[PDB]
Design an enzyme around this catalytic site. Structure first.
Site, PDB file in Angstrom:
ATOM      1  N   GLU A 117      77.805  67.201  65.063  1.00 22.85           N
ATOM      2  CA  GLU A 117      77.722  67.383  64.089  1.00 22.85           C
ATOM      3  C   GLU A 117      78.853  69.148  63.313  1.00 22.85           C
ATOM      4  O   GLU A 117      78.880  69.730  65.137  1.00 22.85           O
ATOM      5  CB  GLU A 117      76.020  68.421  63.539  1.00 22.85           C
ATOM      6  CG  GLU A 117      76.781  69.192  62.549  1.00 22.85           C
ATOM      7  CD  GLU A 117      74.997  69.723  61.843  1.00 22.85           C
ATOM      8  OE1 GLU A 117      74.323  68.652  62.672  1.00 22.85           O
ATOM      9  OE2 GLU A 117      74.632  70.183  61.107  1.00 22.85           O
ATOM     10  N   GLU A 203      72.121  76.702  51.946  1.00 21.25           N
ATOM     11  CA  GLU A 203      71.193  76.593  53.339  1.00 21.25           C
ATOM     12  C   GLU A 203      70.282  78.171  53.417  1.00 21.25           C
ATOM     13  O   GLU A 203      70.171  78.515  54.448  1.00 21.25           O
ATOM     14  CB  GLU A 203      71.439  76.181  54.475  1.00 21.25           C
ATOM     15  CG  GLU A 203      72.132  74.908  54.763  1.00 21.25           C
ATOM     16  CD  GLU A 203      72.246  75.017  56.536  1.00 21.25           C
ATOM     17  OE1 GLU A 203      72.404  75.503  57.090  1.00 21.25           O
ATOM     18  OE2 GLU A 203      72.384  73.675  56.603  1.00 21.25           O
TER      19      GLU A 203
END
Ligand SMILES: *[C@@H]1O[C@H](CO)[C@@H](O[C@@H]2O[C@H](CO)[C@@H](O[C@@H]3O[C@H](CO[C@H]4O[C@H](CO[C@H]5O[C@H](CO)[C@@H](O)[C@H](O)[C@@H]5O[C@H]5O[C@H](CO)[C@@H](O)[C@H](O)[C@@H]5O)[C@@H](O)[C@H](O[C@H]5O[C@H](CO)[C@@H](O)[C@H](O)[C@@H]5O)[C@@H]4O)[C@@H](O)[C@H](O[C@H]4O[C@H](CO)[C@@H](O)[C@H](O)[C@@H]4O)[C@@H]3O)[C@H](O)[C@H]2NC(C)=O)[C@H](O)[C@H]1NC(C)=O
Ligand SMILES: *[C@@H]1O[C@H](CO)[C@@H](O[C@@H]2O[C@H](CO)[C@@H](O)[C@H](O)[C@H]2NC(C)=O)[C@H](O)[C@H]1NC(C)=O
Ligand SMILES: *[C@@H]1O[C@H](CO)[C@@H](O[C@@H]2O[C@H](CO)[C@@H](O)[C@H](O)[C@H]2NC(C)=O)[C@H](O)[C@H]1NC(C)=O
Ligand SMILES: *[C@@H]1O[C@H](CO)[C@@H](O[C@@H]2O[C@H](CO)[C@@H](O)[C@H](O)[C@H]2NC(C)=O)[C@H](O)[C@H]1NC(C)=O
Ligand SMILES: *[C@@H]1O[C@H](CO)[C@@H](O[C@@H]2O[C@H](CO)[C@@H](O)[C@H](O)[C@H]2NC(C)=O)[C@H](O)[C@H]1NC(C)=O
Ligand SMILES: *[C@@H]1O[C@H](CO)[C@@H](O)[C@H](O)[C@H]1NC(C)=O
Ligand SMILES: *[C@@H]1O[C@H](CO)[C@@H](O)[C@H](O)[C@H]1NC(C)=O
Ligand SMILES: *[C@@H]1O[C@H](CO)[C@@H](O)[C@H](O)[C@H]1NC(C)=O
Ligand SMILES: *[C@@H]1O[C@H](CO)[C@@H](O)[C@H](O)[C@H]1NC(C)=O
Ligand SMILES: *[C@@H]1O[C@H](CO)[C@@H](O)[C@H](O)[C@H]1NC(C)=O
Ligand SMILES: *[C@@H]1O[C@H](CO)[C@@H](O)[C@H](O)[C@H]1NC(C)=O
Ligand SMILES: *[C@@H]1O[C@H](CO)[C@@H](O)[C@H](O)[C@H]1NC(C)=O
Ligand SMILES: *[C@@H]1O[C@H](CO)[C@@H](O)[C@H](O)[C@H]1NC(C)=O
EC number: 3.2.1.151
Lengths: 222, 696
Positions: A117, A203
């Site tokens: 990631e 987020e």
């Protein structure tokens, strides 16, 4: 329009926009809704409103993002990944923790579990920080007159690299091939990995009366 | 205690800061909180009252892919100058006004500790720091500081520690300035650009001698042994070296050996070490930590163990994972003080043998992602294990009977092995929190004896074996499972009865069992937080309309290939996969409208559903594959079927019908007129891909 479901999405041409309320249970008395405004060529504009409060105030509640659809290729064969993103943010009151970030997931095969990631943090509001085993940056790299500090961390069986900007970037224009090339050359990222997902979004951690508007977003893989 | 001036100064300092996560809440002017000594972060003296310590430091709490710290934002007031006797000041993780370090810190005249590391300070280091004559511990690392002159260091003649990492370091004569501190012991210069600034031999000659013990030199693009050779002017007193993340490309320097008193060597995350530990080792005799992770060592494991033979009685942690090491793990119990050993992801094609009987102190061991063969060793030789991962290997043979003597194991993972059987001692673990033995050729039957005393089991994974699980009636289980993963396991002719006492379980995969009994009455309600329910390929019969009650965590429901009958069960508001094919349901499916559903995959094929399709599909725009084939539907299709813009498949054949981009397949055979979807939220943040090999 605007949709408030937990897993609901909107699939347009060469773009998909998710709500992704994947950790809504960690908080109490919260809500979120995302919507697409205009699509033109390869440019997509959207917005995301939310209000999360209480509960586990140290966890990410959602990753409402605008992902790109593309034919998966190896990192070797990628020439350039142009990207632009102009956003504005509007919170209210206090105790506001959120984030704006690109996410790139790569794995060994075309459709496999995410092994690597890569997050690009364009803004870190109110104490939001990337995953780090040591809690300290391990590299300082400049790409296109933009400084970044690199963090490395574990996520189950996945290795997460994070490029946190030194200063908030509300208007971003870059080629993400540079980041991946730097990771493969210095940080040991295998060059035969398949880049499976590319997306960008917010987020939230704790925020009241918050709204983020992406006026423009573009991405491509050559 | 608590002279009023100190209380007023601390209150004034509090007023400036903007706390938001409950810190400093113990402070106040109320009469109930008059005493200074009881405040958080404030420590006074026993005889006098002036406080000694002000430690307002925070810590990181981390989640799946993010971390958080309750940082204190505000302005550092100068009223702290009222602290004339303070000597401890730790404001580390808080982010203040991201500006220069305050200048009044130089006027404390009694400071002995200062830790401003990992704050968001910036700018040049204040030049008044020359007044801190009595400082001993100075930490200013990993801030956006700019350091290009170290002239203030010469006046600080009491330090035993100096941390200046993560800075835009540009001091070409740093060695000469550092050497001027006679009592320096530990030096932190990580993340600086020390590669560009290597000391010259002449200035090393023109310098005093100071006995350094710990070096933290990481995150500098060294890439060669010629750029860090200067640290070998410290062989007499060196005790710890940290050289991780340096892109080193070559043999580990032979002078690392012959370093007496060395106890902590970190060489993780390099480019190519090309052979690993050289022959120069074995002279260490005091090594207690050796991290060579992710370095491409390419070393023979017995050679490494024989070259580490000097520190058998002292080596505690040995990290050697993400390398390419080959051979066999032989004679590991000869290391008396070993506690951790990591060997993940190697090219180990060998055995795991002991060939002599001596106990081990290992508490953490993992040998996963290798090509190891042969049988397991006598696990009673490792009495103090706490974790044990041996997945993805080619181990054969039964699990040894000594596995029940651990009494401290918490995790045991033996998945993807060729293991043949399970012992009866498995019950006596009493502290196991997870057991995974999936994808092995496991034979025999597991009675209650194997599960007699697992009072802390939370994970049970015996997926895809030839195993059997028969428990006697009137057995009271001692565990409350939260995940139940028993596919392709013979759970018995009847529905398992140990499920009655099982509550608070998140997933349940008992598919491919041989259950040939109707749904029991006691199995009327699932736990509220149920997530996955898979009962595929069984012979269960009854009505499921009273079994699903719309929980808020449903993601996968698979009741296919059974003998279910009755009205269609209520569809959960957050379910994603809804598979009900090959059953005996009947009636209309008009109840798929009353609530909004986020399903992405539903299959109702091979049943006896009749009636008309409801004109309510606008409430489920999340659909990807829709299957209503081999049923007895009739009537005109709903126009709302044109509103499923996310459809990729629509199978409707063998029916009695009459009368949207990305629709790859469109089957409408008869009726009288590989595909892959995404289930998101499976692995927490990460999604999961499901392939539908639909027929044609
Ligand atoms: C000035 O102030 C600053 C404030 O910012 C001070 O800085 C802080 O200082 C404190 C100490 O005062 C530090 O706390 C200490 O942290 C260490 C490190 O913990 C982390 O690493 C652990 C080990 O990681 C390895 O192993 C794990 C698996 O065990 C693995 O996942 C890792 O990836 C890593 O593996 C690598 O190494 C292996 C072996 O070599 C290799 O095989 C492998 O391949 C890799 O190369 C880790 O276990 C630990 O985990 C914690 O966090 C996770 C995630 O949050 C959580 O899930 C766990 O449960 C743990 O909570 C961390 O990731 C830590 O070891 C210290 O522990 C001491 O304290 C505890 C308290 O109970 C004792 O029990 C211990 O015995 C021990 O005494 C301690 O916590 C802090 O990290 C540091 N922070 C920063 C930002 O600097 C600074 O020191 C101050 N200066 C002065 C002069 O005062
Ligand atoms: C608490 O206060 C006492 C009193 O001042 C301190 O003890 C003094 O320490 C100095 C320095 O060592 C001596 O010169 C004095 O003679 C000591 N006082 C007496 C009465 O003997 C003590 O050090 C303080 N506590 C701390 C932790 O610093
Ligand atoms: C380990 O230390 C020993 C000394 O304890 C080193 O021995 C020296 O070098 C060789 C070894 O073959 C011999 O000449 C002597 O044993 C020593 N030389 C002297 C005393 O002048 C040994 O070399 C060290 N290990 C390595 C790999 O160098
Ligand atoms: C399961 O383990 C527990 C551990 O506490 C056993 O409980 C006691 O164990 C001690 C031995 O350390 C015996 O002296 C006691 O008689 C045990 N108590 C009871 C009530 O049995 C327990 O015996 C174990 N289970 C079985 C079936 O033996
Ligand atoms: C789609 O879903 C909505 C909401 O779940 C349904 O709205 C219901 O409509 C009936 C009839 O007007 C009301 O009695 C209910 O109170 C409504 N429910 C809610 C939650 O508002 C709607 O009927 C469904 N079908 C269609 C075709 O819209
Ligand atoms: C630092 O020490 C010198 C020497 O006594 C003194 O003159 C000066 O005032 C001190 N600095 C401060 C800020 O007090
Ligand atoms: C060499 O060391 C002497 C020690 O007396 C010192 O005076 C001199 O300045 C040093 N040389 C340089 C170039 O600093
Ligand atoms: C320090 O290292 C240098 C290497 O350039 C060497 O010439 C010098 O003698 C050393 N000084 C010691 C070991 O005291
Ligand atoms: C229920 O399960 C949760 C895990 O989700 C656990 O934290 C809790 O302790 C369990 N409660 C009981 C009574 O087993
Ligand atoms: C349910 O289990 C069967 C076999 O155990 C498997 O084939 C199927 O894919 C599972 N259901 C889902 C949704 O994965
Ligand atoms: C268990 O089920 C399998 C597959 O349906 C079958 O072949 C086998 O005979 C069954 N076992 C018993 C004891 O009925
Ligand atoms: C369940 O259905 C299958 C086929 O529909 C049938 O062969 C089987 O006998 C049924 N089970 C019972 C218990 O009748
Ligand atoms: C199936 O539907 C037909 C008419 O379309 C009719 O025979 C009856 O309703 C059903 N028959 C069976 C055997 O299911």
């Amino acid at each position: 329009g605007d949709y408030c479901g937990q897993w609901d999405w909107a699939k347009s041409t060469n773009y998909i926009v998710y709500n992704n309320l994947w950790n809504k249970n960690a908080a109490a008395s919260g809500s979120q809704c995302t919507g697409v405004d205009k699509i033109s060529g390869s440019t997509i504009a959207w917005h995301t409103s939310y209000t999360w409060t209480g509960g586990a105030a140290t966890e990410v509640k959602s990753y409402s993002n605008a992902a790109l659809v593309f034919s998966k290729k190896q990192i070797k064969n990628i020439k350039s990944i142009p990207t632009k993103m102009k956003y504005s943010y509007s919170h209210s009151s206090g105790t506001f923790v959120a984030d704006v970030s690109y996410d790139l997931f790569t794995s060994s095969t075309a459709s496999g579990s995410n092994e690597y990631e890569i997050m690009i943090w364009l803004a870190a509001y109110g104490g939001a920080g990337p995953i780090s085993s040591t809690g300290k940056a391990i590299a300082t790299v400049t790409i296109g007159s933009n400084s970044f500090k690199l963090y490395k961390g574990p996520n189950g069986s996945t290795t997460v690299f994070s490029f946190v900007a030194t200063k908030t970037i509300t208007n971003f224009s870059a080629d993400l091939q540079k980041f991946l090339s730097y990771l493969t050359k210095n940080q040991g990222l295998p060059s035969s990995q398949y880049l499976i997902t590319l997306e960008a979004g917010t987020e939230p951690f704790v925020g009241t009366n918050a709204k983020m508007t992406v006026s423009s977003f573009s991405a491509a893989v050559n | 205690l608590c002279i009023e001036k100190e209380r007023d100064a601390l209150l004034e300092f509090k007023r400036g800061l903007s706390d938001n996560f409950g810190q400093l809440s113990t402070w106040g002017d109320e009469e109930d909180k008059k005493e200074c000594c009881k405040w958080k972060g404030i420590e006074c003296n026993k005889t006098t009252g002036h406080v000694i310590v002000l430690d307002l430091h925070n810590a990181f709490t981390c989640s799946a892919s993010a971390c958080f710290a309750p940082r204190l934002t505000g302005k550092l007031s100068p009223s702290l100058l009222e602290l004339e006797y303070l000597n401890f000041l730790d404001l580390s993780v808080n982010e203040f006004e991201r500006s220069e370090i305050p200048r009044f810190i130089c006027s404390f005249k009694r400071l002995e500790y200062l830790n401003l590391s990992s704050s968001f300070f910036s700018g040049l280091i204040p030049t008044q720091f020359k007044n801190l004559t009595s400082l001993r511990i100075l930490d200013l690392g990993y801030n956006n500081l700019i350091v290009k002159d170290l002239t203030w260091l010469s006046h600080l003649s009491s330090l035993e520690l100096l941390s200046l990492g993560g800075s835009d370091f540009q001091v070409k004569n740093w060695f000469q300035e550092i050497t001027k501190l006679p009592l320096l012991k530990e030096l932190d210069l990580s993340l600086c650009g020390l590669s560009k600034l290597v000391p010259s031999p002449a200035e090393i000659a023109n310098s005093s001698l100071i006995s350094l013990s710990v070096l933290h030199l990481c995150c500098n693009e060294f890439s060669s042994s010629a750029k860090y050779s200067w640290l070998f002017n410290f062989s007499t007193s060196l005790t710890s070296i940290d050289l991780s993340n340096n892109q080193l490309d070559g043999q580990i320097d032979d002078r690392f050996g012959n370093l007496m008193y060395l106890e902590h060597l970190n060489l993780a995350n390099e480019l190519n070490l090309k052979g690993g530990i050289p022959s120069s080792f074995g002279n260490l005799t005091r090594l207690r930590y050796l991290d060579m992770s992710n370095t491409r060592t390419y070393q023979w494991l017995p050679e490494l163990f024989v070259r580490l033979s000097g520190s058998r009685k002292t080596l505690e942690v040995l990290g050697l994972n993400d390398n390419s090491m080959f051979g066999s793990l032989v004679d590991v119990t000869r290391f008396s003080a070993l506690k951790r050993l990591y060997l993940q992801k190697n090219v180990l094609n060998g055995f795991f043998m002991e060939r002599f009987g001596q106990v081990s102190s290992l508490e953490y061991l993992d040998l996963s992602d290798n090509q190891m063969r042969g049988p397991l060793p006598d696990l009673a030789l490792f009495p103090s294990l706490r974790e044990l991962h041996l997945g993805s290997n080619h181990f054969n043979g039964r699990i040894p009977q000594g596995i029940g003597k651990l009494s401290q194991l918490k995790i045991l993972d033996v998945s993807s092995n060729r293991l043949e059987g399970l012992p009866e001692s498995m019950g006596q673990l009493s502290n196991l929190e997870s057991f995974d033995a999936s994808y092995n050729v496991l034979k025999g039957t597991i009675t209650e004896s194997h599960l007699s005393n697992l009072s802390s089991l939370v994970d049970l994974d015996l997926s895809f074996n030839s195993l059997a699980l028969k428990t006697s009636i009137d057995w009271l289980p001692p565990f409350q499972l939260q995940v139940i993963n028993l596919p392709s396991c013979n759970l018995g002719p009847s529905f398992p009865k140990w499920l009655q006492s099982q509550n608070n379980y998140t997933v349940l995969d008992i598919s491919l069992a041989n259950i040939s009994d109707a749904l029991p009455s006691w199995f009327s309600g699932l736990p509220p937080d149920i997530k996955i329910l898979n009962l595929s390929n069984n012979q269960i019969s009854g009505r499921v309309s009273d079994l699903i009650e719309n929980a808020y965590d449903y993601m996968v429901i698979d009741l296919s290939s059974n003998n279910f009958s009755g009205p269609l069960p209520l569809v959960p508001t957050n379910v994603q996969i809804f598979y009900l094919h090959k059953n005996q349901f009947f009636g209309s499916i008009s109840s798929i409208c009353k609530s909004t559903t986020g399903a992405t995959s539903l299959d109702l094929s091979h049943n006896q559903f009749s009636g008309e399709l409801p004109d309510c599909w606008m409430n489920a725009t999340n659909l990807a594959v829709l299957n209503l084939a081999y049923n007895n539907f009739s009537g005109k299709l709903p126009q709302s079927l044109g509103s499923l813009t996310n459809l990729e498949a629509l199978y409707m054949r063998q029916n009695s019908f009459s009368g949207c981009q990305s629709l790859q397949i469109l089957d409408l055979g008869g009726n009288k007129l590989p595909m892959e979807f995404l289930v998101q939220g499976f692995y927490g943040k990460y999604p999961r891909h499901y392939s539908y090999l639909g027929n044609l």
